[PDB]
From Swiss-Prot, chain C:
(Microbial infection) Interacts with rotavirus A non-structural protein 2; this interaction probably plays a role in the sequestration of DCP1A in viral factories. Interacts with rotavirus A non-structural protein 5; this interaction probably plays a role in its sequestration in viral factories. The chain holds residues 539 to 576 of 582 of the full protein. Necessary for the degradation of mRNAs, both in normal mRNA turnover and in nonsense-mediated mRNA decay. Removes the 7-methyl guanine cap structure from mRNA molecules, yielding a 5'-phosphorylated mRNA fragment and 7m-GDP. Contributes to the transactivation of target genes after stimulation by TGFB1. Essential for embryonic development. Coiled coil: none annotated. It is found in: Cytoplasm, P-body; Nucleus. Belongs to the DCP1 family. It comes from Homo sapiens. Detected in heart, brain, placenta, lung, skeletal muscle, liver, kidney and pancreas. This is mRNA-decapping enzyme 1A.
Length: 47, 43, 42
């Protein structure tokens, strides 16, 4: 039963705002991955 | 103005998640922009 | 973009993502383009 739909650009804008604003599980997943990327990629030295 | 209904949101969620995840992992410029805008605009 | 030292908290990230999605016109184009790429598995 694996259905996909296509959002227009305006409907993508609305949907993403809903999800970031209201879906705390959606937002935790983004932030956990963001954290992972920053800690992994931090250069040992700067200039 | 009107909003998307729950059905569209529910069927879109995981592609939207993957889209942002793709950008966060693979586009250093995408995170630059978040950091700049937070510093420059939001604080 | 070489090195990222800033680390936003969850609600800093949320607030910034929403500001850009609301107000930044090319940022949205960029999301849309990658989304269509994700959707069409290409």
């Amino acid at each position: 039963a694996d259905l996909s739909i296509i959002l227009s650009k305006s409907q993508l804008q609305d949907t993403l705002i809903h999800l970031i604003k209201n879906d705390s599980s959606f937002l935790s997943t983004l932030h956990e991955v963001y954290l992972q990327v920053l800690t992994k990629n931090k250069d040992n030295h700067n200039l």
